[model samples]
Target: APVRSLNCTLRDSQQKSLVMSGPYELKALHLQGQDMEQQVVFSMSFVQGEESNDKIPVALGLKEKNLYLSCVLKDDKPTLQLESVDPKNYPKKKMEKRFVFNKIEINNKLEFESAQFPNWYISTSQAENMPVFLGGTKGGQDITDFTMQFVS
Candidate 1:
């Protein structure tokens, strides 16, 4: 069998780095792009270590045993928010309504900006839980950059 995994790093607007504990498996659902529309939409999952048990889902709406990534437009810019479902029975309806990846840029780093908030980038926190959220981008090359290196 072939291996499917990659490493992700998160950085702040101030040139600081926050290393994710491990390389995550690329388990993102290909929601769009080559099939339906020109854009790409994904319901991705990232796991801890190598077990399928520690799962984190990144999508638009909240669901049981999932991590939610919401994108909204404000002042003509794109923004995002992170939500975690509790007890895996987390209450959410019409999850598809929040389904859209209108503004995610990929360069060296996967850049995410808030249409809801400006000057904020999706950077990881300094804590152990590795909480993902919007942070200021007053740092470095103004790239809002990071790398996704894959290994088997």
Candidate 2:
């Protein structure tokens, strides 16, 4: 398994990077060149999927916190969340499924599809400074593609 620290930036079409906003919220916003506010680095670790080992499953953790990105159902809709769980204890936790994402790479960009919600992908809103949420294949409004730039 491999682990690396990287910054997730939305494709140039959007020109925003994933950022931690207000307490526990995740948002995407246009950043001033390497601005610390939008330079939220994520430590990604490769892991096995719940039902399949061949799939490229990954755990994305905020570099500054113990929180890991998760997708959960809220009001019957798949939503993005940051969950606090020690990496050592994650495997035994039942909610672990929500924290794992299948990493799909295409056309030099990446899509993080929720393991718990299958086809639901982590997406950013069309409008800037909005909360990051989950989007399905049918929606054309939200952008789900991103580029992960590794930080040395």
Candidate 3:
């Protein structure tokens, strides 16, 4: 079969066409972009929350928008980017913290690196509806290490 390009536009859980490229959840249909690459077009600027072949789209900054998986700290927490918002248009530097899951891999995966802390990963704090935060380990495989599965 011939290789096909991704010409189809992405839609969110609300069924709205993706305004720009960033981290988008397939199941829930969400997307978000960090400040640095927030100005890029919809076909560019991707990669959100962690990495590994098991994760979603990958390069991130380009016209094709690999839509890779990497993490962004939101209020000291790590949640998947669901949509892209221009920080310049928002209040100020307040969109970098917030996830749900068992444990966060203390060690870095492929291209995804930990922000706020060098080697820390994201983990739950309290309620399932609350925000998650960064966590770390001393090199032992404990509950902090987790496996991420991407669903299409």
Candidate 4:
């Protein structure tokens, strides 16, 4: 299959990140983008067959890189909250969403298959099971343009 490009962005069941949410874009990430810092991302959403707001954060850590697609998934309704979080306390929940790529169908390959974005680590924070975590102390680099690979 020819390599194509696709993007996806997941929002919490709270309806925080959405088209009708009054134009919200964040430039000030909560964590400092450092080299030693862990650039983690996460997904928060409602369980399939259910729309109740049991908003949860699923841990997604990049040994070292960034996912540029999810930030670009349009035409569909997906809420997303990508950020740097505590590497040690992100929730590692079971994968329950539909083949996230089934809806886009770009380049005839699923984003998870073609992109193969690494699996996000399970959440470590019991009380604050946040999804994204950047290097807190032992860190280096500016947290931008990082994908889910290329870390050493």
Q: Among these predicted structures, which one has the highest TM-score?
A: 2
Over 4 Å off, model 3:
1-84, 87-116, 126-129, 136-143
Candidate 1: C-alpha RMSD after superposition: 14.5
As for lDDT, the candidate ahead, 1 or 2, is: 2
Candidate 1 per-residue lDDT, tens place, 1-152, comes to: 22122233233433343322333211111222353231112233221221222222222332123545655554755544444456344233223323222234344345544433545655544333344444556454333443332322
Clashes of each: 11, 0, 21, 35
Q: Is candidate 1 or candidate 4 better by lDDT?
A: 1
RMSD in Å for all candidates:
14.5, 3.6, 13.1, 16.9
lDDT of 4 by residue, 1-152 (tens): 22222222322222122111112222222232352242223332211222222222222322232321132223542323343434343322332232121121223221121111222211111122233222222112312112222222
Model 3 lDDT, full chain set: 0.31
The whole-model lDDT of each prediction reads 0.36, 0.71, 0.31, 0.24
Q: Which 10-residue window of candidate 4 scores lowest in summed lDDT?
A: 120-129
Kindly list the per-residue Cα lDDT of model 3 for residues 9-108, writing each as its tens digit: 3222222222333245322112344632232232222223353544332212213443322355578664445443443332222223321111222344
Regions more than 4 Å wrong, model 2: 1-13, 34-37, 50-55, 87-95
RMSD of 3: 13.1
Model 1, residue 140: C-alpha shift (Å): 5.2
Instruction: Put down candidate 2 lDDT per residue, 45-130, tens digits, no spaces.
Output: 66655544334777787775778888888898888888887756543323367778888777776778898887898888778888
Give the candidates in order of lDDT, highest first.
Answer: 2, 1, 3, 4
